[PDB]
Design a protein around this ligand. Structure first.
Ligand SMILES: Nc1ncnc2c1ncn2[C@@H]1O[C@H](COP(=O)(O)OP(=O)(O)O)[C@@H](O)[C@H]1O
Ligand SMILES: [Mg+2]
Lengths: 77, 76, 52
């Protein structure tokens, strides 16, 4: 959480929640005799594609919104 | 119900090429129903989600790599 | 001929057996962390420092 605060400043609660959930669901697979290397390899692939998917289909260019984008971004936080 | 309804909208957007506007649907916590968050003005910086996924995955990977703990008793 | 040296003292055999048992215990402890499918160990010192 501290690292997220220094390098981003927001999403600090989300990153702790996601990481704990990621570990909880991964351990369920390990209990099913899935090797941790397979789980780790799968998690690494999913993280790469999630970033790639976000950058290609879920981003909005702020130049199309003007000043209202900054206020909405600030208001949301 | 809300997650299922939210997931249903997002499933439609991915499988239907002409319903791509449903990607922006999020949650309206005030009323408890899906809502187009791009129009509603609920935005986040892209780096917040991207860095969260990278950092959470590495933290989860680090713990998942452990299967043995040796806890030496303090000298005192 | 027949019998040989009695070897009255038994301590050397016990020492050898204990040495072998300790070495085998260490090897079996670290066996799990070998190869591409081996996992890591977390060791917490007396001072509290943690290493993986
Ligand atoms: N007006 C809103 N309507 C719906 N969801 C929102 C709204 N504002 C914020 N959210 C969501 O609520 C979450 C709150 O995050 P927050 O806990 O403030 O961040 P952090 O993890 O840094 O503490 C955000 O992930 C955001 O997606
Ligand atoms: Mg926040």
């Amino acid at each position: 959480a501290d690292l997220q605060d220094k390098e981003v400043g927001d999403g600090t609660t989300s990153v702790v929640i996601i990481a704990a959930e990621l570990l909880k669901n991964a351990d369920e697979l390990v209990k099913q005799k899935i090797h941790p290397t397979s789980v780790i390899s799968g998690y690494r692939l999913a993280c790469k594609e999630a970033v790639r998917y976000i950058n290609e289909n879920l981003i909005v260019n702020t130049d199309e919104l003007g000043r209202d984008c900054l206020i909405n971004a600030a208001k949301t936080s | 119900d809300l997650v299922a309804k939210l997931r249903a909208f997002h499933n439609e957007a991915q499988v239907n090429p002409e319903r791509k506007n449903l990607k922006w649907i999020g949650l309206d916590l005030s009323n408890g129903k899906p809502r187009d968050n791009k129009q509603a003005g609920v935005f986040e910086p892209t780096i917040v989600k991207v860095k969260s996924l990278k950092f959470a995955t590495e933290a989860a990977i680090t713990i998942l790599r452990i299967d043995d703990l040796i806890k030496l008793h303090p000298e005192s | 001929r027949g019998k040989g040296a009695y070897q009255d003292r038994d301590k050397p055999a016990q020492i050898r057996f204990s040495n072998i048992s300790a070495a085998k215990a260490v090897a079996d402890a670290i066996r799990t962390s070998l190869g591409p499918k081996g996992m890591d160990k977390m060791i917490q010192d007396g001072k509290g420092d943690v290493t993986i």
